[PDB]
Write a protein that binds this ligand. Structure first.
Ligand SMILES: Cc1ccccc1OCC(=O)Nc1ccc2cnccc2c1
Ligand SMILES: *[C@@H]1O[C@H](CO)[C@@H](O)[C@H](O)[C@H]1NC(C)=O
Length: 362
């Protein structure tokens, strides 16, 4: 029985995009004081037309009406040590992404809003409801997430810490694990002005999204960038230095979503000099942004997401797997580097699949 069970939120004002209740899937582990709260990813929408299209063909990302009663935990959400060497005995929570707002929104469906964008409030409400289901006894709350959910970790981890402090639980240690959500606002390989969804670069799409969602960002980052510039806080290398909670960053050096938003579409044809240099510079820039991130795992592979994949234990950087690096991170946060137990693991080779342990794509 690997199953997490669905609970729809008791506060029915906290909703998915279409006004159906948001929710969470939970598998308790009696007697563990560790809680893993995972934020699903799945891109985002930023205006009426592209949200309407998402509602037709990605409806589970906008509504709870068709969610199943259970889900199987995989990767870091597995309860089997064979699959999850890191946290197999933890309390497991999977929070479906049904707000299409990179977990940033704070707006309800109303006479002026066709859709609700409540991602930031969904996280707060899940935490509130879990406190009565055992989270009050926690020693560590790891807020994890992949893709848009990894960016969601960066945007929300300090708010979870603040919420728990204000509710009277200052002993729960809040930490973040951001997988595949560390994007660059870099020069694109080909460029289009923002005239529709597919042509709109991330900085422009997110600047529009924040206004459409009533998006919120972490306070220290908001104070740096100020009004109109909060889109900056969606880029990991800019928001990370403002955060107080410990955050472990997992990012492929050649992330497929980064390449997509850079207008790079590989085709198996030979790569010529311009694109070769572009890809190599992308890996170098990503590595440079991680230079001062002490807890990080960044393999030289063309891929996207890792922590909820069943074979997540297979990739290694410098001979260390991700479950090992996460364990070393836990040790480093006990009340000086550790012999043979590294936490900063960034590949230096310059081309996808120069690391032989990269996912095969099979
Ligand atoms: C939060 C964020 C900041 C910066 C960059 C990306 C970010 O989120 C992920 C993202 O945009 N993902 C996708 C996924 C599929 C796509 C297909 N076609 C075009 C664009 C697409 C974009
Ligand atoms: C329900 O959620 C809304 C929106 O986040 C919040 O303002 C309200 O206080 C919540 N109600 C309760 C009882 O928690």
């Amino acid at each position: 029985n690997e199953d997490l069970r669905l609970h729809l939120l008791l506060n029915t004002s906290v909703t998915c995009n279409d006004g159906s209740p948001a929710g969470y899937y939970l598998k308790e582990s009696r007697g563990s004081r560790r809680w893993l709260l995972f934020l699903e990813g799945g891109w985002y929408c930023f205006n009426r037309e592209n949200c309407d299209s998402r509602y037709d063909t990605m409806r589970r990302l906008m509504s709870s009406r068709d969610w199943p009663r259970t889900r199987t935990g995989t990767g870091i959400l597995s309860s089997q040590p064979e699959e999850n060497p890191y946290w197999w005995n933890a309390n497991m929570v999977f929070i479906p992404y049904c707000s299409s707002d990179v977990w940033s929104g704070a707006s309800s469906k109303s006479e002026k809003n066709e859709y609700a964008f409540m991602g930031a409030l969904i996280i707060q409400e899940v935490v509130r409801e879990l406190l009565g289901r055992g989270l009050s006894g926690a020693k560590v709350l790891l807020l994890a997430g992949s893709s848009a959910g990894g960016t969601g970790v960066l945007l929300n981890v300090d708010r979870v810490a603040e919420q728990l402090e204000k509710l009277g639980y200052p002993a729960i240690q809040v930490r973040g694990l951001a997988d595949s959500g560390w994007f660059l606002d870099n020069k694109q390989y080909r460029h289009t002005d923002c005239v529709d969804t597919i042509t709109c670069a991330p900085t422009e799409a997110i600047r529009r999204g924040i206004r459409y969602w009533n998006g919120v960002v972490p306070e220290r980052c908001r104070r740096q960038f100020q009004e109109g510039e909060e889109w900056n806080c969606f880029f990991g290398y800019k928001v990370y230095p403002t955060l107080r909670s410990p955050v472990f960053v997992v990012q492929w050096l050649f992330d497929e979503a980064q390449l997509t938003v850079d207008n790079v579409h590989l085709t198996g044809q030979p790569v010529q000099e311009g694109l070769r240099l572009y890809i190599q510079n992308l890996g170098r820039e990503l590595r440079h942004t991680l230079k001062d991130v002490p807890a990080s795992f960044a393999p030289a592979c063309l891929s996207h997401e890792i922590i909820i994949r069943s074979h997540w234990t297979d990739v290694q950087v410098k001979g260390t797997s991700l479950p090992r690096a996460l364990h070393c991170w836990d040790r480093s946060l006990h009340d000086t580097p550790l012999k043979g137990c590294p936490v900063h693991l960034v590949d230096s080779c310059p081309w996808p699949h120069c690391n032989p342990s990269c996912p095969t794509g099979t």
